[PDB]
Write a protein that binds this ligand. Structure first.
Ligand SMILES: O=C(NCc1c(F)cc(F)cc1F)c1cn2c(c(O)c1=O)C(=O)N1[C@H]3CC[C@H](C3)O[C@@H]1C2
Ligand SMILES: [Cl-]
Ligand SMILES: [Mg+2]
Ligand SMILES: [Mg+2]
Ligand SMILES: [Zn+2]
Ligand SMILES: [Zn+2]
Ligand SMILES: [Zn+2]
Lengths: 252, 270, 69, 47, 48
DNA sequence: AACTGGTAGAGATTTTTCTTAGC
DNA sequence: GCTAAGAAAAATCTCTACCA
DNA sequence: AACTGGTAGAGATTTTTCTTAGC
DNA sequence: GCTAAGAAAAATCTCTACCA
């Protein structure tokens, strides 16, 4: 156990590993490995989208793209007012978690209706990838145009072929697998951070061997079934449970 | 004896239609005879068997239905294993708009199985052509039995309660529909893992892909075949693939079927 | 000759006593009870019956299956 | 139903005076009514 | 075979052995919620 | 401040009764 | 003659639809 | 021959956590 | 310093209406 913590600290001092790899290699819990990463001075987005409008056959196609994965959602608009752009943004924010929207300085994007939608759904709008996505979508649309009667069917068939049928990148994944893996990794991070804060609201008085007195207040990191890991004096150490007292702390 | 009582009980049931306890007490026949007299009458037998079944909950199954609100037509689709909702307002209840809603849904999320009722928009050639092109299995419920798709009708109820909660913050009904979808998907927690519906659909689909890749890498380097003895007759079946050897039993795969066999009836050969 | 007819009558007795069931079901928009039909397949939740040379699927909650002694 | 079996077994015991296990296996009636058919005959006895 | 195919095959087989022993525990770190017969509540977290 | 769901049947599970073979 | 295995017949327990 | 009720909230009961007095 | 009573806060279990 403590040998695993010592090997993890020496290996991070050499190579600066991440906490998932250290927890899987050295067989330590994840809160301990995250503390080892968080104590290092040299070691201290999944919700950003971009939007644009374009033209095809006299129609208006609005395109939104998830940036870290390349994931496309598109639609055909009857006009280019601010109310239709606000309805598209409200549908997108109701289906995927959107926190940061990046657009250009168009007219319909600089509007009171889009501003009211961003106020209600709590999005950060920023005015200045989508050009490459418009070119790629237009090549697929021309590649499958003879199978559809209307332009709306061809647009949605091209979105399906782009998202699930084209493979590339490092491991040969599509865009849907990449967006799902990215958001799932972020969810794991936030749940572990909630556990970390709830544990770190405590305090530990511990008694070393060959002494009767209690030492200073060390902060609890992990409380197991038979052992207790504490941080004290910028040092992580493992004390048995029969030489410890854990009390609540009020130091806000 | 009671054989004359059997004859009088048959005449009595032919006139009055007694239940079995009345005949078994008034004619002093055994209860099996009285139950048979009642069971051979067609004017009786008006009662079901009092149980419920259980719908399909595979990780790529969706259910779809339509509802009405303030003179409009809403169309609701639910992901069954997680509870994830998509919804829209249709200008008409035809088959063209239903085919376009299904095409957009199949472009956004992976759909392989769809369950619907027998309305005129879901049994249509446009929805048939979209399911053919996008490779979906479309199944229909038993007619006039809404319990076969209980998840989407329960979500009709939840959507209407949220819409009445936030009705005064919007002007039109399409705005209030999309605000209700956001509040259901992301602002309500509680359930299997303490998740919301968006977190649950992310966890379910990511877990599906991860576990296929892991057991592909495990099974591509396996060995230690197992010959096992099972059945009513003590025969011996051929090459089976050992998957996991445990404290008490082993797990084998035979002809693409999973089986759990104890250690006394199997022999491992490297 | 006689013993073969004894074996044939025994096997036909077991075959006839396996699956001679009657089904009273309830179907339609106005859910009325209808006459006896022949059971074909019985799964958990629903059954498939043959009535008047027509196959129908009824749930097990809307049908009664009568066996023989 | 076995009600026609009860009538047929009564005719058959009136001819040949069967026992009760024979009638209960041949005519597929329950054992209580077959024992009662043997009990009502003044010449036979259930054994 | 030449030398490059030999060195690639050797390191690949060694990696497959050690990663097998880790991947089994990795696949057993999932949790399953299941349903038995004629009971309509989802039973607790068994292990896959 | 003084009001309110219930009835009966279809199967499943547990218990009692009855015949017969073995020691 | 006494005892126990096996099966038949009876008793109890849980669950469902319909009543404007 | 291959079909099927479910979702989420209001209380009641059981369990875990936290402070303080007594020996 | 150690132990137990008491109460607060959290976790589990049973039951209901509505969905054309
Ligand atoms: O009675 C309904 N719901 C209430 C309810 C429930 F949801 C779940 C339950 F367990 C019990 C319930 F009483 C209901 C009725 N119908 C339709 C519905 O979708 C629907 O939900 C529907 O679409 N059709 C189309 C197909 C043929 C035509 C048009 O008649 C039917 C009527
Ligand atoms: Cl229907
Ligand atoms: Mg419907
Ligand atoms: Mg419905
Ligand atoms: Zn570092
Ligand atoms: Zn009757
Ligand atoms: Zn006689």
């Amino acid at each position: 156990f403590l040998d695993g913590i010592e090997k993890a600290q020496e290996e991070h001092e050499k190579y600066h590993n991440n906490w998932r790899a250290m927890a899987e290699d050295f067989q330590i819990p994840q809160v301990v490995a995250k503390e080892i990463v968080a104590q290092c001075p040299k070691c201290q987005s999944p919700k950003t989208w971009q939007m644009d409008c374009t033209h095809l056959e006299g129609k208006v196609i609005i395109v939104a793209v998830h940036v870290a994965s390349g994931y496309i959602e598109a639609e055909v608009l009857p006009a280019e007012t601010g109310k239709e752009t606000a309805h598209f943004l409200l549908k997108l924010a109701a289906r995927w978690p959107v926190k940061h929207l990046h657009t250009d300085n168009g007219d319909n994007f600089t509007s009171s209706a889009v501003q009211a939608v961003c106020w209600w759904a709590q999005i950060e709008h920023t005015f200045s990838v989508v050009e490459s996505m418009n070119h790629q979508l237009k090549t697929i649309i021309t590649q499958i145009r003879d199978q559809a009667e209307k332009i709306e069917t061809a647009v949605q068939m091209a979105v399906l072929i782009h998202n699930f049928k084209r493979k590339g990148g490092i491991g040969g994944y599509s865009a849907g697998e990449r967006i799902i893996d990215i958001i799932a990794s972020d969810l794991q991070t936030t749940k572990l951070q909630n556990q970390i804060s709830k544990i770190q609201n405590f305090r530990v008085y511990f008694r070393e061997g060959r002494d009767q007195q209690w030492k200073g207040p060390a902060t609890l990191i992990w409380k197991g079934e038979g052992a207790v890991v504490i941080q004290d004096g910028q040092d992580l150490k493992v004390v048995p449970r029969r030489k410890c007292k854990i009390i609540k702390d009020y130091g806000r």
